[PDB]
Nucleic acid binder design. Structure first.
Ligand code: MG
Length: 102
DNA sequence: GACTAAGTCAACC
DNA sequence: GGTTGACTTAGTC
């Protein structure tokens, strides 16, 4: 296929938002992206590292530790509540200012 | 075409 | 897996 019309930032945000808990683990971020965008069924070690970079680099995704083991392995990732509706209203490729913190 | 957000590669933790 | 950074790629005005 051709590449979906969304940035990883957009992708990760749709994945978190649809989450029943509004937070996912890395692997669950990967699974959503693959369940819906067959394009991402390929080239995995390239884009999966780029998802990790996004999650760490971007202030709009903060991690939320697990507690009582649950399944276990891997933190949870959620959206900073002060992110606004950023990749929202028709701009999924380039944000008009990336959410940086202070 | 600039300006700066986004994606790559890759070491380290 | 989660951070970092140096550097490239690319959307948008
Ligand atoms: Mg982050």
């Amino acid at each position: 296929h051709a590449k979906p019309p969304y940035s990883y930032i957009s992708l990760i945000t749709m994945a978190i938002q649809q989450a029943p808990g509004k937070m996912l683990t890395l692997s669950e971020i990967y699974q959503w992206i693959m369940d819906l965008f067959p394009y991402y069924r390929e080239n995995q070690q390239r884009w999966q590292n780029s998802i990790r970079h996004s999650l760490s680099f971007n202030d709009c995704f903060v991690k939320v530790a697990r507690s009582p083991d649950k399944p276990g392995k891997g933190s949870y990732w959620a959206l900073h509540p002060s992110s606004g509706n950023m990749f929202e209203n028709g701009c999924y490729l380039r944000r008009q200012k990336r959410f940086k913190l202070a």
